[PDB]
Design an enzyme around this catalytic site. Structure first.
Site, PDB file in Angstrom:
ATOM      1  N   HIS A 123       1.015  -1.231  -0.121  1.00  0.00           N
ATOM      2  CA  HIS A 123       0.013  -0.050  -0.037  1.00  0.00           C
ATOM      3  C   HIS A 123       0.856   1.204  -0.039  1.00  0.00           C
ATOM      4  O   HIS A 123       2.291   1.168   0.233  1.00  0.00           O
ATOM      5  CB  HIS A 123      -0.829  -0.013   1.279  1.00  0.00           C
ATOM      6  N   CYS A 139       3.379  -5.059   6.444  1.00  0.00           N
ATOM      7  CA  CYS A 139       2.970  -4.739   5.027  1.00  0.00           C
ATOM      8  C   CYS A 139       4.372  -3.908   4.248  1.00  0.00           C
ATOM      9  O   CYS A 139       5.111  -3.503   4.801  1.00  0.00           O
ATOM     10  CB  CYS A 139       1.884  -3.833   5.120  1.00  0.00           C
TER      11      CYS A 139
END
Ligand SMILES: [Cl-]
Ligand SMILES: [Cl-]
Lengths: 164, 165
Positions: A123, A139
């Site tokens: 992201h 992440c």
């Protein structure tokens, strides 16, 4: 169609969570599961293009803090990334891009791309200083302008290979 | 005492380390035998945490009811409304433990983060109080800030957390 090898400990719901699908969809695609979920067996994961015909490949280096996008096994773009902290590392191994959402905002920035591990994805970020550092919960983070480029190109089903 | 974990096929030093928020050095040091291999079914020690069966608290989460219930010596003492994972990004079910905690992380995590024994998962607060009671998260359990503070101030690391559909 994308296949998955059932592991000991897997459940219908744990698999569903990794691949961001309903158990309904999982069962619909796999009549064999009525007989029980058994380690070593193969199941198909619905909702995805055939990954074998996808000419894109994403390679992530946790050590170099880079993500490379290749097309036909040659590199299109290279981006700096943030990765997981030493106690909450980005997992290594073979994953797929499962889906994406535009402009989730907040700490997720311009795009979220789901990886085939529950809760994990690639992201954007509201924090540019984090890029290039081991600082996330696990992440992969990119600058917004970079994740926008990435998302605009790669289809769901694209392989993401994460190495040290 | 010491908390133990039963190895499953597919586990690696790194995957276990990520679940329990420890270094692979810590994991190896506590389990010298692991260098010879991991076998499914074997029990290993997870350092830094007590025997969960020594802690008299037990947390029960119901995804259906959207509730987290706290018990002490098998008596229910408090129940809290919670948010849980969206249908495509559900809260995982099974047996977990609270692993560590951080006060006032802020942002979407609000007043407290409690790590659960699954990588990336925890119980935390929220800067979106309207979300509590709904299936809206990426997989974590969310509580009102005042609620997670209360829960965290009662229960120690190692506390058993059972999550039921
Ligand atoms: Cl996340
Ligand atoms: Cl999170």
């Amino acid at each position: 169609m994308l296949t998955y090898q059932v592991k000991q400990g897997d459940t219908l719901n744990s698999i569903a969570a990794d691949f961001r699908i309903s158990t309904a969809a999982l069962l619909q695609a796999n009549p064999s599961l009525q007989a029980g979920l058994t380690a070593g067996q193969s199941i198909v994961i619905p909702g995805l293009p055939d990954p074998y015909t996808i000419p894109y490949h994403i390679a992530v280096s946790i050590g170099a803090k880079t993500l490379t996008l290749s097309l036909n096994n040659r590199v299109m773009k290279t981006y700096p990334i943030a990765v997981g902290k030493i106690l909450t590392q980005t997992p290594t191994g073979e994953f797929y891009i499962i889906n994406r959402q535009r402009n989730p905002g907040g700490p997720f920035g311009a795009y979220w791309l789901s990886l085939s591990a529950a809760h994990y994805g690639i992201h954007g970020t509201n924090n540019p200083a984090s890029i290039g550092k081991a600082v996330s919960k696990g992440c992969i983070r990119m600058h917004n302008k970079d994740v926008i480029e990435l998302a605009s190109i790669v289809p769901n089903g694209t392989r993401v290979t994460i190495n040290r």
